[PDB]
Design a protein around this ligand. Sequence first.
Ligand SMILES: [Cl-]
Ligand code: NA
Length: 129
Amino acid sequence: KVFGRCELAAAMKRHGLDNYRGYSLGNWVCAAKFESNFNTQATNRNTDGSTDYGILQINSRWWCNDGRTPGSRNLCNIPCSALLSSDITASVNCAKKIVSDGNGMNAWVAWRNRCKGTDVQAWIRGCRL
Ligand SMILES: [Cl-]
Ligand code: NA
């Protein structure tokens, strides 16, 4: 599913991401924009053989099981395919664990490089939330 901007903001709020670990909703929408362009079915293969999945491009080295990332963990206790669903619940619940891991949203390199320190509230501006 390719979400609209305000549609994703509302779904993220519904699932408790607004201000989670202190990160306002616009931070999460901005991260999803640059990770996946709001497409739940986005995937990306990394040089090390791991794969990133879903709207927030969550990686199989630590967070989900895809059966093809040797030595990896599955700390969100989900198949990576669950991160591709039109229902964002699994992505949101896993992102909550990731953002609590110690480095906040810096875990998403694209958030650090493209959202951090910018006017992220613009990503939710105009939306009925
Ligand atoms: Cl903001
Ligand atoms: Na894994």
